[PDB]
Write a protein that binds this ligand. Sequence first.
Ligand SMILES: CC(C)CN(C[C@@H](O)[C@H](Cc1cccc(F)c1)NC(=O)O[C@H]1[C@H]2CO[C@H]3OC[C@@H]1[C@H]3C2)S(=O)(=O)c1ccc2nc(NC(C)C)oc2c1
Lengths: 99, 99
Amino acid sequence: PQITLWQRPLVTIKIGGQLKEALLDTGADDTVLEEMNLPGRWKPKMIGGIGGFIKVRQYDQILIEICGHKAIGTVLVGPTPVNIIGRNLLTQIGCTLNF
Amino acid sequence: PQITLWQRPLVTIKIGGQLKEALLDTGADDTVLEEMNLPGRWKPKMIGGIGGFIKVRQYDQILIEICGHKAIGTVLVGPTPVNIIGRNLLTQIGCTLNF
Ligand SMILES: CC(C)CN(C[C@@H](O)[C@H](Cc1cccc(F)c1)NC(=O)O[C@H]1[C@H]2CO[C@H]3OC[C@@H]1[C@H]3C2)S(=O)(=O)c1ccc2nc(NC(C)C)oc2c1
């Protein structure tokens, strides 16, 4: 699809057997999801944003279906206020900015 | 232009007679710039992000040239780690996501 930005660019994702909504975020290098139950090994990471830093769990080679497109990559899980799809996954679904 | 997301989507902006780089950010509702010198009245605001909340100065009807496109709107000035162009200005330059 083409998505205009009069509203937040939210899409449906499927990850770890669960349905969620997430924001297509061109200002996010990485993908950060709210606390959820993901299987397997994970590594501690700290990421920074507007008001400081949060601790996240880093999960690698995670399958995510983003608006019906499959991608595999790193997902960070932790206290983000909203689910963010970052450029690590936006590049895999062929997402571009146009003006 | 069309912009792919293999790198951060940075553009040149001109605001208050100054040249800066800023990130085209679809995950930002509002435009947040690092401390800079802007003329005129401003109102205190608090905005939240990944690691908490920051205090910003809200400036209304501010002219910004974003990659050679003129827009006028609200700009927030405060301790953001990076200059962010949010959807309040991305809609004015006709910016879309496509995949
Ligand atoms: C600040 C910006 C440079 C990066 N951020 C992405 C940005 O789009 C971020 C996404 C977001 C949205 C809503 C709530 C949030 F907590 C976070 N937006 C953001 O800070 O916007 C704030 C401000 C903008 O205007 C309004 O719209 C949303 C609120 C509100 C105030 S981030 O902090 O969420 C972020 C996301 C993914 C990241 N991956 C990394 N990886 C590093 C290791 C490089 O860093 C990340 C940092």
